[PDB]
Design a binder for this molecule. Structure first.
Ligand code: MG
Ligand code: MG
Ligand code: MG
Ligand code: MG
Ligand code: MG
Ligand code: MG
Ligand code: MG
Ligand code: MG
Ligand code: MG
Ligand code: MG
Ligand code: MG
Ligand code: MG
Ligand code: MG
Ligand code: MG
Ligand code: MG
Ligand code: MG
Ligand code: MG
Ligand code: MG
Ligand code: MG
Ligand code: MG
Ligand code: MG
Ligand code: MG
Ligand code: MG
Ligand code: MG
Ligand code: MG
Ligand code: MG
Ligand code: MG
Ligand code: MG
Ligand code: MG
Ligand code: MG
Ligand code: MG
Ligand code: MG
Ligand code: MG
Ligand code: MG
Ligand code: MG
Ligand code: MG
Ligand code: MG
Ligand code: MG
Lengths: 63, 394, 131
RNA sequence: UCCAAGGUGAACAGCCUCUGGCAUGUUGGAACAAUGUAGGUAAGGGAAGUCGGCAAGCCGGAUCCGUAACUUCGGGAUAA
RNA sequence: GCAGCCGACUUAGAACUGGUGCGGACCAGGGGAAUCCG
RNA sequence: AUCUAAUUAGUGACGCGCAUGAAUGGAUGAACGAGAUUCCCACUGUCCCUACCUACUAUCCAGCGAAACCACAGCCAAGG
RNA sequence: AUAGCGACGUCGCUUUUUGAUCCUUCGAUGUCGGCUCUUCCUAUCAUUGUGAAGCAGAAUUCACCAAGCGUUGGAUUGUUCACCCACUAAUAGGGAACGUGAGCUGGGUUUAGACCGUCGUGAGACAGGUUAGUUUUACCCUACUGAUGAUGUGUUGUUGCCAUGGUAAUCCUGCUCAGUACGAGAGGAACCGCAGGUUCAGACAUUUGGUGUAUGUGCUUGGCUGAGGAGCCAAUGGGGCGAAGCUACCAUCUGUGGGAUUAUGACUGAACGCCUCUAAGUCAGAAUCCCGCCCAGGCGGAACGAUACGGCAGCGCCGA
RNA sequence: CUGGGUCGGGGUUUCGUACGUAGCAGAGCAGCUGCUGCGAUCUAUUGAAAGUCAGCCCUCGACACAAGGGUUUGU
């Protein structure tokens, strides 16, 4: 297996789940589920979505 | 006039009486052919459907791309607590068929097995087999049934062990255990019978009935769908939108002069809850149930030699609509018939198989245990807590 | 040595797709799918890596009003790899080849699916990116 | 045929409310099968369906730009 | 030409701000090229 | 000839016109048309190829309750 | 002359063409096509097994057993027919009241409104063209699909047998064989393996996708409860995301073995001293047939369990 | 001394960070001589709040309930 990270949410992707996406200019992206996929397609910036690992890291929450 | 354009007919007439099954437990219509050369062994088992999940496994088949690659496959979990052998029944061939000759029952029968003999256990006085059981502790009964054993050995050609499941260990509402006759295939009738006579009132685990990476058959009852129209019962073509008296129908029933509706014409009616036997399902893993080993319990029955975790086969929050499985289970490739917590009959293969798919060895490297009650995200609670960190609830 | 696995097919007859080469054609009107027998009322459909017949509805004048073999290299319908990943691209696109297999053009713009690549070796040589 | 409130809004449009009125339009209860009648939503394709884009769907208000052929010189025109 | 006191809805411009959402419900023209006839 | 991959369709020409033709009006033509046709863009469950959801039915029950139709009636094959 | 054809003749079969007739129906059998769906025929296009070529291979002809299984997607036309484009293995032909309108549609024929051409003095006519033109009823009987139940075994229950019915799988590609056999060359096979796919069938929901009134959780328009908070109304207010459940070649899983034999090729072997597959006897033999696997389970049976109080009582077996 | 049922508690999961309070965070504006008010929004408490079987999983926490009722059947 190659356990790997979601492009938008930043969670952990397991072999059976998720969805792959290939843009016309390369840049293969990976999504945990339709939630993250729809956010990315609607071009939501992960920095302002609260439940995202990027948002938590940027706001220094946890640790 | 002929049809302008041909098309294969919808549905199959091989399953023609599309009626609700008269039975709820799958019936073994044909047991594997007997041969005295092989040693004695059972030929069938009873399990319960729990759910489905992934497996990641390495593929070994020269020629294809998946060779030396790893793929994910859907598997179905069947909980199979060990059966209890509570009788033996003999059969003799006659020119009119295969007639039953004599049944002999064990001295001790569990009340969970005696539930099957009553339509209302609550109001009953539970008097079943009370007078029959007295035949074992007196010399009159002992010499009554020993010559019966001798007569069965002399005149019987088929021996089937009457064994019942053990629903006390299942997380189900039902306490009335199922029971069935599992034919004994082995040597001659004498040893075939004096091998069951000590298995009487004893345990039979599935690990000694089936083996790994073996092709078996599953007999069960489909999920019921109730009264369904023709377009969903037979998957006929849907009529155009301009149709006046409905469009989910079949336009022409039949010609004129046959003067009757033929049995081959699709009609509305009952869909689902049919009896079905699906062959060639491959065992992937015969799991081991929970067991207490020196105080603590061993729970890692879903831990492979490539994963080395401590996760059980149960997903997070247990199997949806079934519960959690704590007994030895059987993992089958692909989907199987029936609904959740439905009883299934496992049957040994009727055919001799010499094929790459049949003889392929199986070596799993990952069993998915994420939650099925939604989009699961974490394999186990420990890793979920490690990723999340402390919460407000503590 | 290994034939392609079945993948979902989301390009029936009548679909116009991008032409990702330098032949000058900008459209590909799927006309029929090679190797399809079909049944009653069932439209022939093509997926990644399948040879089709196509016409150019927009492009260089000499490429129009004519029937060209073509190969589909990208599709937007999600298809499942045997390893268990569902993959789908941004657009439906193909290239123009002849019956033997080599491309009429010389270069391909954008990624090329692995199923197309390992099945048509000549296209994989010109493919800038893979999967 | 006469009388005609408040808000939104161009509006006596549609929607909500006050004064006044009414008890769901000649019956109720329990289920939520098929087939209907009336509404919706659908991956990828986009008329390949059909005699025929029938039906449904797209557009839609207002402000600022821009607006062709043709013309009976007025229009076309809310062109696009 | 100024000072004071009252005032009715408009129009334009700017900053800030929201997960690009803003005629958010309701109301509310699909478009173009041609032929026949009137 | 053009339109399409493919056109008994459409448009533009050709005219020997079975049987066109000048107030039994000929030709054209802006604007208009719940008029009749063809093509293109956009859009879509028309279709590939179906699925799911909602409301009222249908369903069962309490009460209440007709009508069309009816020689006698109602399982088939062949024969005459 | 007879691989393949076949003149001049001559004998037949079929009722999927048209005729001929007028037997039934005029107190009405709804009159073209298309859509949908089932079954049947073989005069076999492909596939299985064969025999013959002017069959070297490849390709292609002719013939036999044979209808098990397939026989497509579109432009033009109301079409049936026809033609073309493309795929395919093949795009064979037909019947069932020219199958099928209380199944649809109504484009065409075939009412009443109109227009034109020809004909007529005229009203009007035209298997000439054009445009618009209400498609009713099942709750009865049967058939069919499913659902209770009845029938005997003393009453009930559990486990079972199978008489009978139904029946299902199909075709292709790639690799290897092999650039080999064959052939001067160009070209160019086959079996056995291996990997897949088409059509069909039976399931199923881990995963992907669809639905979504858990009316679950945010957002938001107009109004309303004095305001905040909390909410509500707009026949589901609208719009994101969405559990469960249903559900898609739009996801995933599975799809089988024998027997007697047909065509044909043979063995031994007479009739007919030799010869002969046939006369007696024997062999191989297939998408055919039958059965198995699979679905249902008979006014059809089997084995086994328990068999009606403690105030009454009902029962079972025995007392030749 | 066992059983289910209701409620509660955990598990899972959906959405996305609640009310209140605090902030020298806030385009700015008004009043009082730096202070006080209006102010969409932002930050912290806050992966918070809410829902979660009705056909999800476990409980051994609380509560009451459960030795019933009716009609039949004989070799
Ligand atoms: Mg046919
Ligand atoms: Mg209608
Ligand atoms: Mg789930
Ligand atoms: Mg069709
Ligand atoms: Mg009402
Ligand atoms: Mg009322
Ligand atoms: Mg009234
Ligand atoms: Mg009414
Ligand atoms: Mg769609
Ligand atoms: Mg879409
Ligand atoms: Mg068509
Ligand atoms: Mg319309
Ligand atoms: Mg215009
Ligand atoms: Mg003209
Ligand atoms: Mg007019
Ligand atoms: Mg057309
Ligand atoms: Mg013309
Ligand atoms: Mg004249
Ligand atoms: Mg004149
Ligand atoms: Mg005239
Ligand atoms: Mg009633
Ligand atoms: Mg009739
Ligand atoms: Mg009649
Ligand atoms: Mg024949
Ligand atoms: Mg009829
Ligand atoms: Mg008409
Ligand atoms: Mg008329
Ligand atoms: Mg009724
Ligand atoms: Mg049979
Ligand atoms: Mg799902
Ligand atoms: Mg979803
Ligand atoms: Mg879902
Ligand atoms: Mg508020
Ligand atoms: Mg109203
Ligand atoms: Mg959604
Ligand atoms: Mg044989
Ligand atoms: Mg012979
Ligand atoms: Mg033989």
């Amino acid at each position: 297996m190659k356990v790997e990270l979601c492009s938008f949410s930043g969670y952990k992707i397991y072999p059976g789940h998720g969805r792959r996406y290939a843009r016309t200019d390369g840049k293969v992206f990976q999504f945990l589920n339709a939630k993250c996929e729809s956010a990315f397609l609607s071009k939501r910036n992960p920095r302002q979505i609260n439940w995202t690992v990027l948002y938590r890291r940027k706001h220094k929450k946890g640790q | 006039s002929h049809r302008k354009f041909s098309a294969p007919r919808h549905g199959s007439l091989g399953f023609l009486p599309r009626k609700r099954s008269s039975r709820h437990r799958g019936k073994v219509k044909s047991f594997p052919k007997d041969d005295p050369s092989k040693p004695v062994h059972l030929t069938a088992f009873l399990g319960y459907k729990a759910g489905m999940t992934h497996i990641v496994r390495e593929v070994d088949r020269p020629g294809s791309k998946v060779n030396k690659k790893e793929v994910v496959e859907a598997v179905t979990i069947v909980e199979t607590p060990p059966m209890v052998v509570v009788g033996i029944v003999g059969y003799v061939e006659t020119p009119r068929g295969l007639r039953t000759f004599k049944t002999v029952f064990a001295e001790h029968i569990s009340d969970e097995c005696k539930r099957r003999f009553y339509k209302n256990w609550h109001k009953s006085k539970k008097k079943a087999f009370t007078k029959y059981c007295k035949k074992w502790q007196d010399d009159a009964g002992k010499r009554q049934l020993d010559k019966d054993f001798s007569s069965m050995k002399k005149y019987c050609q088929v021996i089937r062990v009457l064994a019942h499941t053990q629903m006390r260990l299942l997380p189900l509402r039902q306490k009335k255990a199922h029971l069935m006759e599992i034919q004994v295939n082995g040597g001659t009738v004498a040893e075939k019978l004096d091998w069951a006579r000590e298995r009487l009132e004893q345990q039979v685990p599935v690990s000694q009935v089936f083996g790994q990476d073996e092709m078996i058959d599953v007999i069960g009852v489909t999920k019921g769908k109730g009264y369904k129209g023709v377009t969903s019962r037979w998957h006929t073509k849907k009529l155009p939108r301009k149709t006046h008296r409905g469009l989910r129908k079949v336009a022409c029933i039949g010609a004129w002069h046959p003067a009757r509706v033929a049995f081959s014409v699709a009609r509305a009616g009952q869909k689902g809850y049919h009896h079905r036997t699906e062959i060639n399902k491959k065992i992937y893993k015969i799991g081991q149930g929970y067991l207490i080993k020196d105080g603590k319990l061993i729970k890692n029955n879903a831990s492979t030699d490539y994963d080395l975790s401590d996760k059980s086969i149960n997903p997070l929050g247990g199997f949806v609509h079934y519960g959690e499985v704590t007994n030895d289970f059987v993992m089958l490739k692909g989907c199987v018939v029936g609904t959740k917590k439905r009883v299934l009959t496992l049957r040994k293969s009727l055919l001799v198989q010499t094929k790459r798919r049949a003889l392929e060895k199986i070596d799993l490297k990952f069993i998915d245990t994420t939650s099925k009650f939604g989009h699961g995200r974490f394999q186990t609670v420990e890793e979920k807590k490690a990723f999340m960190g402390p919460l407000k609830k503590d | 040595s290994g034939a392609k696995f079945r993948i979902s097919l989301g390009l029936p007859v009548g679909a116009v797709i991008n032409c990702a080469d330098n032949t000058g054609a900008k459209n590909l009107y799927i006309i029929s799918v090679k190797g399809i027998k079909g049944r009653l009322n069932r439209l022939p459909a093509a997926g990644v890596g399948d040879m089709v017949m196509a016409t150019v509805k927009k492009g260089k004048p000499e490429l129009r009003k004519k029937v060209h073999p073509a190969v589909v290299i990208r599709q937007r319908k999600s298809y499942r790899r045997k390893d268990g990943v569902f993959l789908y691209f941004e657009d439906n696109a193909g290239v123009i080849v002849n019956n033997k297999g080599e491309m009429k053009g010389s270069a391909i713009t954008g990624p090329v699916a692995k199923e197309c690549a390992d099945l048509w070796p000549r296209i994989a040589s010109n493919a800038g990116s893979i999967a």
